[PDB]
């Protein structure tokens, strides 16, 4: 015979533990340093493979050229720290929540990293 | 006003991409050397984050002390490569499949790494016969 099993919500469970390690700042290999004009400088630790799984730009960024081993600090301009936070939070939880006055900004940052999922979601809200 | 959104199958999508990165050996930070008895040696590269998310044992051994961040080679003992390769494939696909005269072996390695999900499924197959 042959025996097969599939834990249905495993990915949801496994991703929740991935977010835990991200808040616990454990097993991280990248540090996003965001700098926007007239904005406090931010700093976001994350896992390269997790961001690469949610954005083709993060994936192409971390798999091309000479990459730092252990911990790679990546400088980032053109996106506000608050927007870079919601993007990471979506990648780690598959959920994104902002105010009415920031959907356009989040949508723009979503396009900058080709997170197509929250691009279309921001579109449905703006033109409701 | 507020806006909320939830990609329900996102976690399945991102895990599929993470399985590709494993099969392409890109961004991997651990290499598991599995030599069981006299079986032919085998190596499995993976991401410590993914393994820590599916196994509390892998999480404990990757998030304690000072690990040489870069590419850690870890020797695995007491488990057969065919079973190990399947536990890794479960961690990246959430699906496991093996033979009948075999459920005992992957249940042991699953118990060895505290993957309760597939431990109960194997136990519920031995009882049901
Ligand atoms: C330019 C900063 O404005 C924002 O986009 C704030 C982001 C947010 O509150 O979700
Ligand atoms: C000793 C290795 O045990 C196995 O993994 C058996 C594999 C199988 O029969 O499907």
């Amino acid at each position: 015979r042959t025996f097969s099993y599939t834990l249905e919500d495993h990915t949801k469970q496994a991703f929740g533990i991935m977010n835990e390690l991200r808040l616990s700042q454990q097993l991280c290999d990248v540090t996003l340093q965001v700098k926007y004009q007239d904005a406090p400088a931010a700093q976001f630790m994350a896992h390269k493979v997790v961001l690469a799984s949610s954005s083709p730009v993060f994936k192409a960024m971390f798999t091309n050229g000479l990459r730092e081993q252990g911990m790679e600090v990546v400088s980032i301009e053109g996106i506000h720290p608050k927007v870079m936070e919601r993007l990471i939070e979506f990648a780690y939880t598959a959920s994104i929540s902002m105010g009415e006055k920031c959907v356009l900004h989040v949508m723009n940052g979503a396009v900058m990293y080709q997170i197509d999922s929250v691009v279309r979601a921001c579109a449905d809200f703006l033109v409701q």
Side-chain angles (χ1 to χ4, degrees), chain A residues 2-34 36 38-81 83-100 102-115:
Chain A
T2 204
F3 172 46
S4 322
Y5 171 74
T6 290
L7 174 54
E8 272 316 345
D9 80 354
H10 168 240
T11 85
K12 303 224 136 170
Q13 288 171 11
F15 250 88
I17 275 145
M18 281 174 183
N19 198 49
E20 278 166 43
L21 305 169
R22 180 189 75 86
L23 323 167
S24 297
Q25 308 198 347
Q26 303 194 300
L27 300 174
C28 288
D29 54 2
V30 73
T31 293
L32 310 172
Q33 267 174 18
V34 172
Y36 214 40
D38 292 321
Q43 175 155 317
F44 301 97
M45 292 204 188
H47 310 83
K48 285 185 174 189
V49 77
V50 168
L51 301 169
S53 65
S54 283
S55 151
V57 189
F58 273 135
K59 169 176 180 209
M61 178 170 339
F62 296 145
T63 56
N64 283 269
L66 230 57
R67 309 265 55 92
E68 268 222 62
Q69 305 303 91
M71 177 51 72
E72 170 172 4
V73 163
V74 155
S75 161
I76 294 203
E77 304 91 343
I79 183 176
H80 187 261
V83 177
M84 178 61 49
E85 165 186 307
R86 327 302 271 238
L87 285 191
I88 283 166
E89 215 145 294
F90 170 78
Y92 277 79
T93 59
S95 276
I96 169 152
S97 183
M98 87 277 315
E100 203 193 4
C102 0
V103 197
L104 188 32
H105 288 149
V106 152
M107 170 183 233
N108 263 342
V111 170
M112 186 173 143
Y113 292 87
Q114 293 168 20
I115 302 137

